[PDB]
Amino acid sequence: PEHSCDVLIIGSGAAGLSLALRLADQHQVIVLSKGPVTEGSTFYAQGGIAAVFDETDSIDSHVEDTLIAGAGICDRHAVEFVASNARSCVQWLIDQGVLFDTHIQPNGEESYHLTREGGHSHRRILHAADATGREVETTLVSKALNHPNIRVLERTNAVDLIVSDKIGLPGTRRVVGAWVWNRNKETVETCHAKAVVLATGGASKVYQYTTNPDISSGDGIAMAWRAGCRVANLEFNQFHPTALYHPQARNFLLTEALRGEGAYLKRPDGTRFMPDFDERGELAPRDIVARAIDHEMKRLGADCMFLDISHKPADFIRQHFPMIYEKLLGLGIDLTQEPVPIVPAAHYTCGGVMVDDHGRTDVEGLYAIGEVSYTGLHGANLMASNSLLECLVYGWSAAEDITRRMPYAHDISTLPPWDESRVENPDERVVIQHNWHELRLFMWDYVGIVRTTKRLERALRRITMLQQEIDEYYAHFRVSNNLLELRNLVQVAELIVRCAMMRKESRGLHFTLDYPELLTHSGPSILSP
Template sequence: MEQHAHYQCDVLVIGSGAAGLTLALQLAAQTRVIVLSKGPLTEGSTYYAQGGIAAVFDENDSIESHIEDTLIAGAGLCEPAAVEFTTRHAKQSLQWLIELGVGFDRVADEQGQPRFHLTQEGGHSHRRILHAADATGRAVQTTLVDEVKKHPNIQVVERVNAIDLITDKHIGGSSGRCYGAYIWNRVTEQVETIAAKFVALATGGASKVYQYTSNPDIASGDGIAMAWRAGCRVANMEFNQFHPTCLFHPNAQTFLLTEALRGEGAVLKRPDGSRFMPDFHEAAELAPRDVVARAIDYEMKRLGADCMYLDISHKPAAFIREHFPNIYEKCLSLGIDITQQPMPVVPAAHYTCGGVKTDLNARTDIHNLYAIGEVAYTGLHGANRMASNSLLECLVFARSAAQDISARVNQMELLTQLPAWDESKVSDSDEEVIIQHNWHELRLFMWDYVGIVRTNKRLERALRRIELLQQEIHEYYSHCKVSNNLLELRNLVTVAELIVRCAMARHESRGLHYNLDYPELLPNAQPTVLTPPQQPSR
């Protein structure tokens, strides 16, 4: 049975962070855009990003240096074309944000003229991080939201879950393209359809697959799972970045302590007050994140300690309050005065370096389907994302996708009659406890078996449990009406399988993937690319 789509547009953007909103704004002059937001428009990983955005603004810096630093941090697995493309488009992407009014911090130069205050983070050889105090993501997100709300060609639909992409397998076509999406409206609790000439996934990463994460609740790998089910390849899912320093406190489980703290002189200490990073890397606290995270994990396990400590109290109190006002206030609200005492820290799942395979225009394997931001694998990050390249990737590839879509949008037909969502064989669930149990089980064994340090046996155990969970979840999904928790669990278990299968395929330790059974580097680094099997639609 076909029905007229509930919504129609030229471009459907699934996700409302920096990537999605940038794409919408870049397209809105000539196209009708719908932006789907899983929660409120300001919720998402962009809003919580603290550190900043990397670009060459210092005359003593160079794009070549930014390229080299990124390649080194990526542990030999970056795709050079993606790195060069991103870094060469960095400054103009930042200039666009500046023109929109993002208030990056400035200081006076030697002549008393204002210039951008650039900070340095792990892996960078120069100060090239533009930031807005320690809340850069908030400044970017709120500015983009304000612009989106002004634009008559952009319609925002909040509190909806994308369920699946509508492709040829739903309509019996053979063009290999995407026609829209099924969405679940969390307000009306109804499934609706959106018809679009083009669809862009900007759904963020999948760190919620782990028990401890710095990400907001919405980071459940939805776009990666939907693209995989639709027939897109994914790559490098074994490289999940664990941020070394999340605040260890029962009331602050997802509060990130930006790498800029270490860039400005904070040091990591054991419970006895002794430093340990010089024992692990010549760059000490400014080593790449994978090195720092493993060092903290190693020291915690060696000492049986609940956490390590990050200390910036040797810096002047006024300096700390000026540069890190949000961190200062947050810690103070928890009884920690960072001008006087160290902060307890643990690593937490932070960033998905792999994702849906795309080209430099953000095109996926399916015609008219794009992927931008953390959901995508562009080749920029390799085996370890360098600090402050993530928001940059969102901006650069959103602008690139917008150019590609703009050149084609007027030649593309909109298919408005789409297959209706079939709920004829489903019923309301009276066993929500099953979802909750499976949810907690998945996140716990992913943390224990597929975390910072892995082994073959742990990966095999994780895969066996994933396969059992998939059977249970598929049975549940086939017979029950959809809900937020069910949709997220369905996506998370798919992403968990992709992470484990990629990890099992890599017989070496490189970057963020560390396997005790394969501790050495292979001589030739290659990305791990998975191709989906043909899957029936619901």
């Protein structure tokens, strides 16, 4: 028909492309990508992927580090599980063409050089200079493009998934495709499939400041919800503690790896502030550091803080942080000689769509893996470099489950075409622009790093106004990117806030002045549609 395949993968970053390869030798796969095929967080990951490779290190530490960085609510099977398959998955990646920095020199022979970021307690982060992402994305991309059974559809923005009991199909609720805005030809076309996989990324763009590409609008979280999936833990959004505070800093992240190799966190006056907050100093986990930086900006009334690796050999630095060095230089900053100004910005969505060990969601035929998901691995706070890591493990387990299921799968039926609504309004379009800004601004102030019930009230009320306001002014409006994206950001913002109002405690990334203490029995926050 319009478009047909066996497995439709929505998203083409680490989660999707990698899942796509595993499926390719025996399935017909179509990977969508809302912008160019490589635009996505993955392409921008710097510091690398955690796995366990050193004789000295052990799966045990990597788990325990994760259970700690997760502030008590990581789900254990989930952490071990995943702790227990990296390299293999990491190895798989390598067997695909990925080149991680080789050492040269244990004191006998060559290996994979390894960094560390906060919460780690052994060195096990494979990287490629200070720009792992480019190497992974670039490669999975190239493999998927040169494979007969995977069709890559760029500039294709999914709008919603097709659920059988919603289009009068009979049988249990299950996904059977998605309607997609074909950016280039400006229609919504229909894509049929036997399995749909959400690999869309996260949502940090709901926040005014973020380390993210402009794609990270939470679309798949929203799609899944509109389709019936429960979602969880969306109050746990991570604000990476060191993003560049420079006017031309579109949105840039200085890797945690910097701290991992000696970088320092300083006050505008030169002093190191972390030890006022946590023995773990520069390498404590992110909810705690981000909070400290936030605390100090407020107390001091300062625009910012600084990241300094000067104390270190120009050469070390330039060989281990090429990309960041090349690029702070264009902004007339010398990572080699000066402290860089940095601020905490929205970086990763710890929560998302509930899914089990094979990436399955609550709706048959619908999977989700990667940042768009919630597995239990990150509890209340991700540990650095577990993210790409989750993307890979779940692309595997999911490939396995699907593969086993495809042979018994129902035959690809015809579907209703999307009802292109078609009204226009040059001015109201602009308004859709005001609202996006509006949202991102109030979520920063009202569902940010420090929180209170009363601010969460303000946030929900404003989101409610936005949704009422949207049904009313943009239910008949012709599809477009901005409108698609705004419906999604607003939807996801609701789940975030509602999840945040449920937690009567301060844990991991959720900190609220009205409950500074810990409950003794916690768990995830769960919302169902």
